[PDB]
Structure 1
Amino acid sequence: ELKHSISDYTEAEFLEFVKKICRAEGATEEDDNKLVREFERLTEHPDGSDLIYYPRDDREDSPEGIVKEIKEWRAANGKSGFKQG
């Protein structure tokens, strides 16, 4: 199914983005990263890719905390959001 934006995805569906990347890595980094790249365009997030790969400081390294980064960041930045569902 196609979406109009990341705001079409709910918080949960997007929180599955990361959970999905965690499982659907494929094999080589390429199959993992190619998922990351599309999601990171949807978020327009800077370090979104790195969110998955390298934990920050006071952030929760969890699929939820990775979402929370993107969530808190975009909300402060005037980006799109998620759908509430």
Structure 2
Amino acid sequence: LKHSISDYTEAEFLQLVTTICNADTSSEEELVKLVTHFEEMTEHPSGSDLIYYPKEGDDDSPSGIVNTVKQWRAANGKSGFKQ
């Protein structure tokens, strides 16, 4: 369920990203945990920068971030979302 990104449906992953973006947590520790989990799941080189330091012209809204992750994994031979 939270072991790998293939365990997440795209809608579920967007829920995770939306929670992070809105800092919808009860403590900083909880937010750091979610960000660390996001990094581990995506395996993307930019790590948390995908969320906090977007590249010029990137959609950094939760949906934009999911799309960037989706496209990157597909283009880099990695498994995608469940279903």
Give the % identical residues: 65
1:47-62 equivalences in 2 (<5 Å) = 47-62=46-61
What corresponds to 2:24 in structure 1? 24
Residue 78 (structure 1) shift = 0.8
Displaced runs of 4 or more, over 4 A: none
Counterparts of 2:79 and 2:23 in 1: how far apart (Å)? 26
Pairing 1:43–2:42 present? yes
Gaps of at least 5 residues in structure 2 are: none
Residue 58 (structure 1) shift = 1.8
Counterparts of 1:26 and 1:46 in 2: how far apart (Å)? 28
TM-score normalised by the chain length of structure 2: 0.82
Gaps of at least 5 residues in structure 1 are: none
Offset from partner CA, 1:28-65 (integer Å, 9 cap, x none)? 3x432221111211111121311111222121111011
Aligned residue pair count: 82
Q: Which segment is superposed worse, 31-40 or 8-17? A: 31-40
Counterparts of 1:34 and 1:4 in 2: how far apart (Å)? 14
